[PDB]
Symmetry: D2
């Protein structure tokens, strides 16, 4: 797939940060390389945000929050900006899909059909909420007017991971912007480009200077500078547990509100009365979608004893059938993992799996001559206490586990520190809702898997997170509630 | 002297048991501590002291009660009725409970009765009403799915409360939690265990299932920490000091555990040029002096437009000097002692720090009476924004009075603070009142009033005064996990 | 085995039954009275004061006063809630007395009145007590230059009229929501069944309701009912009953641009698909129509059965129908009482005769029962077609039609081919089928694998000609408020 | 100086104006046409196809089919949203064309049409686009045995009738809410002002609305109007306009138990208290009435003035009245245009004559203006009492009565002593007085230190005989929704 002219021009120059409505270099001039994970080549050279750059972005966001058009605009004017931003992203859909394929590694056609569509729709959806963020009037006494206001919290720092780089930026920014906050946001070092391209479109849509500030760089410097900044009012992070925990401990010092979206080890449960054809397809897609680089991937596939060997046989064939290649080549179904480090991590987990006694029924090694490719992998002969069953692998790797009763699968499914999502396959109306009610996860799909939409909340129970993104629910993260009492005698 | 109620005598005449799994019990290791009467300094009761092991027993009971048996299976109508029967019982025991508050915490009995017990009753009545009404969403996305959310109780919640409004504080924790269907492990402050441990009898009589509520009296370092660090508690909520608030957020990180915190303040109470001055003088005085200043949302910075500053200082000084200090169980008392010797010493050292930095004690500024933990109502003037006493929460009957010259100036100076719990604004102008309310960074703003709370209105801090809200519908969301269910109907 | 009369019921019934206006038990101004009957025995059960247009006037003036000034107008929402809760506690204390009154006056079995009606009544008040403090409006972010807020103000004096089939429960569907908003109430019970409401007036008084907040005016539809409908100073009307009256009500309400809520009748389908759990569906189909003697607006009076199970379900329905124990509501043996009046017995027996002459076959029942009182046998009609009178029209008795079908598309179309739309049942074990069918039925309530469930928290009301508006739930509140949008210029 | 006509406007007016049915521009089946006029010149402005009963039937069938099957029924909520936002974008792109059509057909000044009416229409659609994905029902925690959820389903085919005073804006107040719920529409504009709607139909098509989702049927009350009101296959009706028609519509809707929303007239009070900012309140009182030539249901047609200020306010209003520049809407200097028709001018002049006959003083104006066109001078009446016709009745012209008062209790009582209750204004600097007075005024919208402000997000509608129900805001959606309560047995 030949590069669009605007992608070629963008990549032909150093990639600048976006602060206070301007494209700028890091103050101290540092740069870093992002790669193409299919070729291992340097894809661009990007300006590297340091602490002093974050502090500049924070002042920019503070000023835009406190005075100027953003602080003065009506809600309808604010909605219109977000709507225009969505339209612009849709206009640049092929450019942005190419950058995602190039920079992240995923198939261009998927980045275009799924990731760009979702980002557009998320911004459309949240433009909608700007004029509808309502407080209460509260009837207490004839002597007072009691009302609440849902005020924006102020300057928000946001950090996102590399698996759905553009989409993830929209999960953070659509709700935050809709409330009237301003933003200092950091993309992942592996994937800065789609966001920094999208910056052009915030400027074009007419966002006032400093409303949005994009600071690409590395967790331990740019990331930690966001986490530790005294003038950031609220933090939101999606990423590592270790980083999640760190963020929470640091935010303690300022009594700062945190939203976290972390990992999972989500179960996808095939009951005796499932439509087995459709469940097999849901189980396969459930783990293999986005190369398994998906926090809510259905990495534990629980299968009723009667169907266990049927599903294993089908999963093995489908895994071997997947077409691996560069995301910018048209026949590719599954691209490489994002980095050498991730490839080595996923291959390490496969070795640990075999070491602990499990059997690789398909895959279980690297693929192709170069690039960070891993073959789709199916593990079988697996038990609940194995490392590969307990821990999030974050690649195209599924464990398949038989079970004999519904009480049992619920227990086993819930016996996890994680609780991001779950799938249940059954044609029975009672069993579907009953099993859904008892699973400890933020999202349950009945007879489907991996569905997300702007309108429906997503987040973790237990150690898969604190709080919800998407829906009306996301808005509450970026608001402070003021209770006003007017003595009316 | 107010004579002790028969049921109060009876209660005080034996060891005060903790309440676990529906039973009154001693600590497993038999440890006990003393609570005191702060007006007299005498030992008031001997109370069973919860240790780590007793928190574990409580958590096990709450877990069991949550996962199966009547509390798990009950309809929301049946749950609501339990909570309303509890409120009715507390109301029947109102005199006994108000006496225990006056005795244990130190506040005037008639205020405990008219304010504290009344609010607790109303907070439970209000929350009983929410059980049947904690609704999720059905979400129109596509003709191919039913999309709905469930607001599920989060599970066992651990709650820690302070000593300044002991019983009311217990109700701000438990009303919302219980309405959601959570089960509870709650620790009263070691200075004020008694009203809660008495009210325990009422939960049992109301018909609460074993283990749905569990009260574990003791100390921050042991009972407190055991709640904070317990792996099987799903969610924590705390009201109290900042150091503990930070500690609790820090520790909750290890479990990715949701935290709600209600912390202290340095709340401004602002008298503008067109205030009704007589009303605003009364509201400025009551704003700080109510509950002996032991009030996180106390109006401890009184900002007074230059035209009225001398007039207001003069009045506050006279009012301060006239307040009648005495024991909470003496009928003539207007203000009781502080809760402890340590608090009295804390406040008095703040006062000394204020004099050391150049402020003037216009009234008060010393201990009171021959015994008990009393501090005189104190008014400081000649104060500047950089002074320790104007920055930090004193938590006694100590007010600073600051003049100002412009609205824009006072809004800046009111907001120049790490705290953001509450604020008051006094002006007769409809545009000024709302404009100033809007610009203040405070979780509650009163226009032409101060210190009003009601179960239906949320309360809590911006900035370092807290995370989250209590009261209102808003409190409920702390105790809920949201589950998004997608049903393929293609 | 006769259920023994509560002493309090015997005392109530030993005197003329007064109406309740402005806090006091009073006679009609003109002293007219009427008779209510015991439909099991046909005896006079009580003599009741008959409200005339002038008694409505006095009730309306009393409600107006209580709304505009005095304790009901001044009370906090907490205070108002507490009255409503205390009323619910009093009803629960008098549960036996009230259930006997239902059984005597209405006819239904005592145990059913106690377990169902009285408990629903109590729960309805407790649920709406809970709303008083939670009737919130909005603050609306538009511009920095304005504060924009709404108030959900009580409409004022509300006129309510209720039917005889669930006398006390129906009073609480009207008053719980109206009282929660802070309205004041002029309410007329059915001439057939005045007594449980008038007994309950004691408990409003004991609970501490201010004078005039509630006013109960027993009498007939053409005098007392019409008076409430036509009264210039009633702000809003709510009615449950006959369509012809519902139409009249809507027509008269035009003249004053008055908001109307209507809950009307139905011809609700109860649909057994091929993959139904036949055990529970057959029980659901039988209780769906026979509950309350078929005197139930949302009765499942059309039972559609997939061709595969048609014979099975017809045979089982006929057996159950023939096994029902008919008798007095105050005899412990009774499973089904009489119909409420001679007029209604005659109406239902007319429909049955009409069903016979249009060609349908009575597979069970189809006639009067026992030696006295207004009893009709449980009746099952087979060999029916969709254009029959008995399949189209509401019968309001223990009369079911059974219709086979061959495809899901077909049953949805036939179920929906009705001017009514109150309720529907769908029996299928399939998770996709249950929701899809539920989505496509035009009915205010759809039960999936059940039938006849109501709860204070879940709204109820008609599509099409089964009504306007909803009762129960948070939804009922909105009928009793006017929304006021306030703009405060803040520069 | 004349505003020069846009090319697209000339083009549109150079042919017969077709109606819009099932996605196509068509003539009336029987070929009837009617004339609309330019009320500044009294010239024929356009010839418009006239919908008859038969054309209404065709629009209803198209809407029915669009509702039951096809893209509109199948589309996601995101897809439906996007159609609505794109419509808003198109309207904005054609803002000058649409503003000219409004100036020409309705009368109002071009620049006000542009800045106010067109901006409000655009923002209305953008607001409602945003609701499509957010129309949520409830999950309701009752028992562990059931999942209880509600669906807010679109009612179906909706019949809407709008007046001539804000033609395009009024069209958006009906369709934004309705289309956001998934309903389909048969909408009739006023015969006096059909053009802007029928121009806008081109933009519904260009946005990509499926065939029959919207259908525009211009014509006359007694034929087109009545056919919408009386149609058996319209599910719900909404109307804005006269009282006599409002009452007709409610009466006719009884026959089908059809939900009705009415936005009717007012005689709204604009109260200037002793502590008002007097300069701002005089400007608010003058604009409250004279905006849109007084052709405004919520016009502040009763200016109450505290006695201290009475003379001052009278003198100011008189000066301001006599200073308004009357002229054609398409003339750049015009501050106020003519009334919409000869009949309206005659009505307003008949009112003014009644006021004189009853003893009131024409302080300014009170007669027609200019050499042709339906102009009336801005008119100020003094020496007025509460019982006069001109004080009680809605005149719908640029005519104000000015009433002195002496106490706040007095002005509230006199303000509320009306069958109308659409809107009110209160002018006071005092924070307690403002909210207190606002709490007591029986009106759907209360402005404190302002007047005539509307926004898509803030509900609007009448207390008493000013209406039933609310338009705008979240509240408007409920009128277009049937609530279904689903119970899923999960035992
Ligand atoms: Na990369
Ligand atoms: Na968590
Ligand atoms: Na103590
Ligand atoms: Na905070
Ligand atoms: Na009777
Ligand atoms: Na209807
Ligand atoms: Na015209
Ligand atoms: Na009305």
């Amino acid at each position: 797939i030949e590069l669009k002219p605007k992608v070629e021009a963008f990549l032909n120059e150093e990639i600048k940060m976006f602060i206070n409505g301007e494209f700028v270099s890091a103050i101290g001039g540092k740069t870093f390389e992002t790669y193409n994970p299919a070729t291992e080549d340097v894809l661009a050279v990007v300006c590297e945000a340091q602490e002093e750059d974050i502090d500049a972005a924070v002042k920019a966001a503070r000023s835009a929050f406190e005075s100027g058009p953003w602080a003065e605009m009506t809600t309808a004017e604010r909605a219109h900006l977000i709507y225009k931003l969505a339209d612009l992203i849709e206009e640049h859909r092929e450019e942005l899909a190419q950058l995602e394929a190039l920079d992240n590694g995923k198939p261009y056609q998927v980045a275009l059909d799924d990731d760009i569509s979702a980002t557009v729709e998320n911004y459309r959806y949240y433009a909608g909420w700007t004029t509808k963020i309502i407080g209460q009037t509260i009837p207490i006494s004839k002597d007072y007017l009691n009302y609440t206001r849902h005020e924006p919290v102020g300057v928000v720092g946001q950090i996102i991971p590399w698996n759905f780089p553009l989409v993830m930026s929209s999960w953070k920014m659509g709700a935050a912007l809709a409330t009237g906050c301003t933003i200092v946001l950091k993309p992942a070092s592996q994937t800065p480009l789609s966001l920094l391209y999208a910056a052009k479109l915030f400027k074009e849509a007419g966002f006032p200077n400093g409303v949005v500030n994009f600071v690409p760089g590395f967790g331990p410097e740019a990331g930690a500078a966001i986490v530790n900044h005294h003038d950031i009012d609220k933090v939101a992070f999606t990423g590592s547990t270790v980083t999640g925990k760190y963020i929470m401990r640091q935010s303690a010092e300022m009594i700062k509100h945190v939203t976290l979206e972390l990992g999972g080890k989500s179960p996808n449960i095939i009951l005796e009365d499932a439509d087995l054809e459709e469940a097999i397809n849901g189980a396969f897609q459930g783990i293999m979608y986005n190369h398994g680089q998906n926090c809510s991937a259905g990495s534990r596939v629980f299968v009723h004893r009667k169907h266990y060997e049927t599903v294993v046989d089908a999963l093995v064939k489908m895994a071997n059938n997947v077409k691996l290649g560069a995301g910018m080549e048209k026949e590719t179904e599954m691209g490489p993992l994002v980095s050498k480090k991730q490839q080595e991590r996923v291959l390490n987990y496969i070795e640990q799996g075999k070491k602990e006694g499990a059997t690789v029924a398909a895959g279980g090694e690297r693929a192709l001559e170069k690039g960070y490719f891993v073959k789709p992998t199916v593990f079988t002969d697996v038990t609940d206490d194995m490392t590969i069953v307990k821990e999030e692998i974050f690649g195209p790797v599924v464990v398949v586990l038989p079970f004999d009763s519904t009480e049992e699968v619920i227990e086993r499914a819930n016996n996890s520190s994680y609780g991001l999502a779950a799938g249940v396959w059954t044609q029975n109306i009672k069993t579907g809702h009953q099993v859904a009610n008892k699973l400890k996860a933020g999202t349950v799909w009945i007879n489907d898997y991996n569905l997300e939409n702007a309108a429906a909340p997503f987040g973790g129970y237990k150690q898969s997170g604190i709080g919800r993104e998407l829906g009306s629910y996301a808005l509450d993260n970026y608001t402070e509630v003021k209770s006003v009492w007017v003595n009316i005698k």
